[PDB]
Amino acid sequence: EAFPITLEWGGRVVRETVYWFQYESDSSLNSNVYDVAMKLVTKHFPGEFGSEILVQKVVHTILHQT
């Protein structure tokens, strides 16, 4: 259910594993790609300029993984 995505912006690298929690009954705890991408970017790349590109790439990676 979890797949790895690493942020690469401005000559940098990190290690992370995204957790997917879909199929939950409430349908709210189910993962949202954009929320996950923004959370990961802010957690690993806090206050980084031009992070919309990185978030877009992370979203594309999430979509392909899912």
Binding site: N32, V33, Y34, D35, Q56, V59, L63, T66
Partner: protein, 564 residues
């Protein structure tokens, strides 16, 4: 006979505008002096050739008395140097003697084309002569000029200044009703069998103009004559007994090449809400943003609200975005101009982004209008879903520039449409430019029934088949998929009919001694066609739009607010 209003059709709106502009001044010259108001000096009509602009001017002149002088551009230029100036001056000189009068300059582009198209000296002298004549026309005795040109950019801008051809009328391309009227006018002196319905050909003759329809009628009549001529200052009753038939019209229709296929068509779409029959919230949003501003301006003034410039659709491919835009344009009875993605791609490749200004001028000239941009993301995709740069590009930049320089007083509304709401340039979504995102979800069961019914509206369908069941089990299908199912069923029915006809012909061959085998699209046809059905957009595709709508437009709608 003398030309008149009833002798011209397909330009009722423009004809009424020209009447409003010109009839009152010429018919009642004394009124203008009393009120001390400025009448028009020159009305410049533009449109593709063959729209009968000369006929419009002739009718307006005849129906208001006055004197009509025609100046043909090619004729003026054909004359020797100096002779052209003499004739051009003499035209205006004489026109006043019979004032009030209307002078029609046909093919103005020939006389005064865009300066960049001119090279010689005497070419510029004639243009200066015409400009000088126009300046003196200001004080002339109720003399008006109506010059016809292909387009506003086809003539020197010096002729478009104040005191000159400053008022413009866009004759444009006739629409279905206009085509029917033109066909009626051209078929007035023709004998036609009852099978012919001009409405069918009018609804079908897309891309034709006034001249082409006359050619179509002539070709149909000549086919009738030739088909009967072989078996036969005329042959008297035999030709007086000539009767055209719908088959002759169809054949002449298939043997004509319309001259305005590539012109941007501006007309009120015939689509209606029942074509989609769903998305009540989207209907309400479109109503609020397109109907009230043009229906209740007083409400917008009473409050400090300013109409929004436009919206932006987004969702799975082929779900009804164009359908919704056309429906909203129909509801307000507003023109509709569509700009497909290939046009934007052509502008990008050819570096012709300057044409966006022309598109917006076209939209402005015909208002209220719903300017619809089908695929704003086409350029973004063409550069990679990336080439290593920002979202900015020349075509979208020009769209932004034109949108910013648009007066909210005009009722031109911009509608976007994309399948990748994330790769769109962020600038176009800024407040003041397309500041709303409307998600067009996959059609629902009721909407699916509506779209199925709309598709089959022109196909004789057996009463046995119930579209509600078909829509029930086709959950997750897009509008394109349902139209595909209908087309497949029609194809199967046609094939069955053809094979049955072949078998009947063979039976006739063996036994030289009859009813329609399959007059309706049988249930079994829809049964087999559904086997070829396939969901176009996967749930993975639905995920992108669902997440986009769940995150954006719902991220921080915290609400839960109330004053003490």
């Amino acid at each position: 006979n003398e030309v008149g209003y009833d002798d011209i059709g397909g330009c009722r709106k423009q004809l009424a505008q020209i009447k409003e502009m010109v009839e009152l001044p010429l018919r009642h010259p004394a009124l203008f002096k009393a009120i001390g108001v400025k009448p028009p000096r020159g009305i410049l009509l533009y449109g593709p050739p063959g729209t009968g602009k000369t006929l419009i001017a002739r009718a307006v002149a005849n129906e208001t008395g006055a004197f009509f002088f025609l100046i043909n551009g090619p004729e003026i230029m054909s004359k020797l140097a100096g002779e052209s100036e003499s004739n051009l001056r003499k035209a205006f000189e004489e026109a006043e003697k019979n004032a009030p009068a209307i002078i029609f300059i046909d093919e103005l582009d020939a006389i005064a084309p865009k300066r960049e198209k001119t090279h010689g000296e005497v070419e510029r002298r004639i243009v200066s002569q015409l400009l000088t004549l126009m300046d003196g026309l200001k004080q002339r005795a109720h003399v008006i000029v109506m010059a016809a040109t292909n387009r506003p950019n086809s003539i020197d801008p010096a002729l478009r200044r104040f005191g000159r051809f400053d008022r413009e009328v866009d004759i444009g391309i006739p629409d279905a009703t206009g085509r029917l009227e033109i066909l009626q006018i051209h078929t007035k002196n023709m004998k036609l069998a009852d099978d012919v319905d001009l409405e069918q050909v009018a609804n079908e003759t897309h891309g034709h103009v006034g001249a082409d329809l006359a050619a179509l009628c002539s070709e149909a009549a000549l086919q009738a004559i030739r088909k009967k001529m072989d078996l036969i200052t005329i042959d008297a009753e035999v030709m007086n007994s000539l009767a055209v038939t719908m088959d002759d019209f169809r054949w002449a229709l298939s043997q004509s090449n319309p001259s305005a296929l590539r012109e941007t068509v501006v007309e009120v779409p015939q689509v209606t809400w029942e074509d989609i029959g769903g998305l009540e919230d989207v209907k309400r949003e479109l109503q609020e943003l397109v109907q009230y501003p043009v229906e209740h301006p007083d409400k917008f003034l009473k409050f400090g609200m300013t109409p929004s410039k436009g919206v932006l659709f987004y969702g799975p491919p082929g779900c009804g975005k164009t359908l919704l835009a056309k429906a909203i344009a129909n509801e307000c009875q507003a023109n509709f101009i569509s700009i497909k993605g290939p046009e934007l791609l052509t502008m990008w490749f050819g570096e012709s982004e300057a044409n966006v200004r022309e598109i917006f001028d076209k939209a402005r000239q015909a208002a209220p209008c719903v300017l619809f941009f089908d695929e704003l993301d086409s350029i973004a995709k063409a550069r990679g879903g990336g080439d290593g740069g920002g979202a900015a590009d020349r075509v979208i930049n020009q769209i932004l520039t034109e949108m910013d320089g648009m007066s909210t007083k005009k009722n031109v509304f911009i509608i976007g449409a994309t399948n990748r709401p994330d790769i769109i340039d962020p600038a176009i979504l800024r407040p003041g430019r397309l500041d709303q995102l409307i998600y067009i979800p996959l059609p629902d069961e009721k909407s699916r029934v509506a779209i199925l019914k709309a598709n089959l509206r022109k196909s004789p369908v057996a009463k046995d088949v119930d579209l509600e069941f078909l829509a029930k089990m086709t959950n997750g299908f897009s509008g394109a998929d349902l139209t595909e199912i209908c087309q497949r069923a029609c194809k199967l029915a046609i094939r069955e009919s053809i094979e049955s006809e072949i078998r009947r012909e063979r039976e006739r061959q063996t036994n030289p001694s009859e009813d329609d085998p399959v007059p309706e699209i049988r249930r079994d046809h829809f049964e087999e066609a559904m086997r070829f059905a396939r969901r176009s957009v996967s749930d993975n595709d639905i995920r992108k739009y669902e997440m986009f709508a769940q995150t954006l437009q719902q991220s921080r709608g915290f609400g839960s607010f109330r004053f003490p």
